[PDB]
Ligand binder design. Structure first.
Ligand SMILES: OC[C@H]1O[C@@H](O[C@H]2[C@H](O)[C@@H](O)[C@H](O)O[C@@H]2CO)[C@H](O)[C@@H](O)[C@@H]1O
Ligand SMILES: [Ca+2]
Length: 193
């Protein structure tokens, strides 16, 4: 299936680049998956004094049965990278809510390794409760700054990412955990470490 809307003015696509820093004012190869429930503009905005890819999302009040249906699902296609000697994949993730009071966001990471059926999903989904935010200190530009980490030795389905396993795509999903989130999201510094 494909989720479609009228042409949207994304920032230039650029070329797949890791670490993804967005400092060339392009998306450095990131784009929505054709199945992403969010297809609005991906632009390069400043977040916490660095350029970051960004989009807007307000999840539906009526929650879909399928937990990824309404989710931003962003992908770095055809990067053909490998983890090397890195234990983690990590990135800066920022929120600028106009509404956030209940439920949570559940952030998942996956890859598409041609040797592993084109899908390998990190086990360690990260949940951000929206009631936690009001007590969290914001950045000077009014964002909530998370550095999210995924242990690449914890993968579903007994699949193993070796140092040399080719990862053709990287996918990040920000799913709605029964939340009332509305606002802006940003990613920066997407890298293995
Ligand atoms: O439908 C949500 C569900 O998706 C699962 O991943 C799928 C993905 O949606 C599809 O694009 C891809 O081709 O295959 C994978 C694996 O079947 C995901 O594993 C679930 O955690 C998620 O709830
Ligand atoms: Ca940056």
């Amino acid at each position: 299936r494909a989720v479609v809307e009228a042409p949207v003015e994304h920032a230039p696509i650029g070329k797949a680049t890791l670490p993804s820093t967005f400092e060339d004012s392009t998306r450095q190869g990131w784009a929505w998956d054709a199945t992403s429930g969010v297809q609005s503009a991906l632009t390069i905005k400043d977040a916490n004094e660095s350029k970051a890819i960004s989009w807007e999302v307000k999840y539906p009040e009526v929650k879909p049965v399928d937990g990824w249906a309404s989710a931003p699902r962003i992908m770095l296609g055809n990067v053909n990278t490998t983890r090397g000697n890195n234990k983690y994949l990590t990135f800066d993730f920022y929120l600028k809510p106009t509404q956030a009071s209940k439920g949570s966001l559940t952030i998942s990471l996956a890859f598409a390794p041609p040797s592993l059926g084109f899908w390998a999903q990190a086990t360690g989904d990260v949940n951000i409760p929206l009631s936690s935010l009001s007590k969290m200190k914001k950045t000077t530009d009014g964002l909530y700054h998370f550095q999210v980490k995924y242990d690449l030795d914890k993968i579903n389905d007994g699949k193993v990412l070796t140092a040399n396993t080719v990862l053709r795509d990287i996918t990040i999903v920000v799913a709605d955990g029964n939340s009332d989130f509305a606002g802006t999201m940003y990613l920066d510094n997407i890298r293995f470490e």
